[PDB]
């Protein structure tokens, strides 16, 4: 908590960040839930009924400044693949976290091949159908770190390969030296 410098906080931006999605449509999608009387946002993908999924979500460019190592906190839900009818033969229960450093913001020009994998992100708890239908999802929290960073800025990216994932929070920070 103390002495943390926040470089990115998806949940606090209130649906305004509009991150790049590749492909657009049937891949990652910005969603809103307002059942708490307060809106919450998320990037969701659930293309579990067709195979060969390779869906990418890329944050906006992050200015590195003096940060030398970054810490990444994700909060997310994952639905049990058994929740789906049976042609879910390509369904997965993990997704992948990537990053890329660059000296310039490439804007809409997103190139998978420039990104390095940080880790596979797996849930401690999957959300089964009975809990989904009762609006009692299981929110997972995972943390990773990356360094050393040397360039003007960096991207984070999330690759889905056929899981039913809702990404509710992405918080990136570094510690003051």
């Amino acid at each position: 908590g103390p002495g943390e410098v926040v470089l990115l906080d998806f949940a606090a931006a209130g649906g305004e960040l509009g991150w790049l999605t590749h492909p657009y449509g049937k891949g990652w999608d910005l969603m809103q839930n307002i059942m708490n009387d307060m809106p919450i946002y998320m990037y969701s993908v659930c293309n579990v009924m067709s195979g060969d999924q390779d869906n990418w979500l890329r944050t906006n460019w992050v200015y590195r400044g003096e940060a030398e190592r970054i810490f990444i906190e994700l909060k997310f839900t994952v639905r049990d693949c058994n929740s789906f009818p049976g042609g879910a033969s390509s369904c997965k229960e993990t997704f992948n976290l990537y990053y890329a450093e660059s000296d310039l913001d490439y804007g809409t020009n997103f190139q998978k091949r420039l990104f390095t994998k940080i880790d596979t992100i797996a849930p401690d708890e999957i959300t089964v159908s009975s809990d989904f239908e009762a609006r009692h999802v299981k929110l997972n929290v995972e943390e990773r770190s990356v360094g050393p960073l040397t360039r003007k800025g960096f991207y984070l990216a999330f690759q889905d390969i056929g899981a039913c994932v809702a990404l509710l929070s992405v918080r990136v920070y570094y510690k003051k030296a």
């Binding site: 509009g18 999608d29 969603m31 839930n33 969701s44 009924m49 839900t77 789906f84 999802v137």
Partner: peptide, 14 residues
């Protein structure tokens, strides 16, 4: 179709 999160709808700021 299948939703990753209950009662969620695609959203885009006005």
């Amino acid at each position: 179709x299948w939703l990753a999160y209950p009662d969620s709808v695609p959203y885009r700021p006005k």
